[PDB]
Amino acid sequence: SQTRVPDIRIVNAIINLLNLPKGSVIADIGAGTGGYSVALANQGLFVYAVEPSIVMRQQAVVHPQVEWFTGYAENLALPDKSVDGVISILAIHHFSHLEKSFQEMQRIIRDGTIVLLTFDIRLAQRIWLYDYFPFLWEDALRFLPLDEQINLLQENTKRRVEAIPFLLPHDLSDLFAAAAWRRPELYLKAEVRAGISSFALANQDLVEKGLELLTADLNNGEWIRKYGEIHHLQEIDIGYRFIYTTL
């Protein structure tokens, strides 16, 4: 959460889908560093942050309205009907038993809504990024199609599930994988790559060849020749989607 600074447009999107009054309680499943947990707590919500990573607990702001729980999504220590709403912001793809995690969200929730910021790379438009860093695409392609995700949630919630695109602005503060789509030079920075787990997990010689090719293309006008029209877009669809329950 140095380059993964929560973006207010994502927070406003989550807040709008939650549609909860001030003083409501939400569970944040797969809270990671807790940036969104704190960001939503600062909107006037109590947040129960659940994250298995013992590391990511320590790397987190102590906040009066955030309670931290170390555990897995498939077995929440939170009681039945203990929260008004539930969120998982770019986390569900890291869960090992997605169905049981969904059942768990339904178990803890009262009258509110489940808001998931997720993705399907199969729904994304052509992005230059993957021509330099194929591992990002390959890692994204491991996760389920949006329809399967919608269906699993819908089956374990018995509330209508809907989905909407979250088109990415060109100036997102939260530097997740495809967020620097209009700022190619940001990928050359070690710290930007440090905030995107796919880089550390990828074959390093591969990452390095991508860096060399990106650097050459940026310095000899090749990137502009091949991809420069992308600079005129204010936003792009890279398959990011909000899945959420309704009445």
Side-chain angles (χ1 to χ4, degrees), residues 1-21 23-247:
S1 201
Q2 179 197 279
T3 63
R4 304 295 295 282
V5 180
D7 193 284
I8 200 181
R9 290 163 294 188
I10 298 183
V11 176
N12 293 342
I14 297 160
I15 290 291
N16 295 322
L17 290 175
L18 284 171
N19 186 42
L20 285 170
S24 298
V25 184
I26 66 157
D28 184 3
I29 311 305
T33 63
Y36 284 93
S37 312
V38 173
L40 291 154
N42 289 331
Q43 296 293 134
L45 291 167
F46 294 91
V47 187
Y48 300 157
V50 183
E51 172 51 47
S53 171
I54 201 68
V55 166
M56 281 168 163
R57 182 210 287 173
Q58 296 154 5
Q59 280 65 27
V61 174
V62 170
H63 192 274
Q65 288 79 28
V66 182
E67 300 301 349
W68 205 277
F69 299 86
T70 302
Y72 299 110
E74 66 272 8
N75 182 33
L76 304 172
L78 304 176
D80 288 352
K81 311 306 174 198
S82 58
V83 303
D84 299 300
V86 180
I87 75 171
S88 197
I89 310 313
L90 297 172
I92 69 168
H93 64 289
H94 300 308
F95 306 168
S96 67
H97 302 289
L98 192 56
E99 184 138 21
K100 181 69 197 310
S101 300
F102 287 170
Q103 294 165 16
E104 283 294 86
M105 294 174 184
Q106 181 56 41
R107 181 184 64 78
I108 71 172
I109 208 175
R110 294 164 189 142
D111 302 332
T113 76
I114 297 176
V115 181
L116 308 180
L117 180 55
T118 186
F119 65 92
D120 186 352
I121 203 65
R122 290 163 284 252
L123 302 172
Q125 71 191 88
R126 176 84 196 288
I127 315 305
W128 66 271
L129 186 53
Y130 314 123
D131 301 340
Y132 298 92
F133 304 118
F135 54 84
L136 298 177
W137 188 78
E138 290 161 9
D139 292 345
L141 191 64
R142 288 191 281 95
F143 194 46
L144 297 175
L146 195 71
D147 288 348
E148 293 185 27
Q149 297 178 53
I150 290 166
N151 183 30
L152 289 178
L153 188 55
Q154 197 157 225
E155 283 169 345
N156 296 278
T157 289
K158 294 77 170 180
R159 298 264 288 209
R160 185 178 69 271
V161 165
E162 282 179 354
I164 60 182
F166 174 72
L167 302 173
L168 301 185
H170 71 96
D171 55 357
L172 285 168
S173 63
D174 193 358
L175 303 183
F176 51 83
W181 63 268
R182 222 185 78 173
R183 294 170 286 174
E185 71 294 337
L186 290 185
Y187 294 101
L188 304 184
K189 301 184 170 187
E191 59 276 37
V192 174
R193 288 177 284 107
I196 306 170
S197 71
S198 280
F199 280 95
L201 299 168
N203 171 291
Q204 301 300 290
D205 287 340
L206 176 55
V207 175
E208 192 57 41
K209 288 282 160 292
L211 295 172
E212 289 169 314
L213 202 61
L214 186 48
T215 304
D217 285 358
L218 287 164
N219 292 339
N220 68 7
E222 284 293 291
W223 189 95
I224 293 164
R225 192 189 71 76
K226 279 142 48 172
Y227 311 111
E229 291 296 312
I230 203 174
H231 189 78
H232 313 304
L233 298 179
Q234 304 315 313
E235 63 190 353
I236 201 172
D237 189 1
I238 315 176
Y240 293 87
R241 296 284 179 284
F242 282 105
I243 292 178
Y244 59 96
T245 50
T246 53
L247 297 166

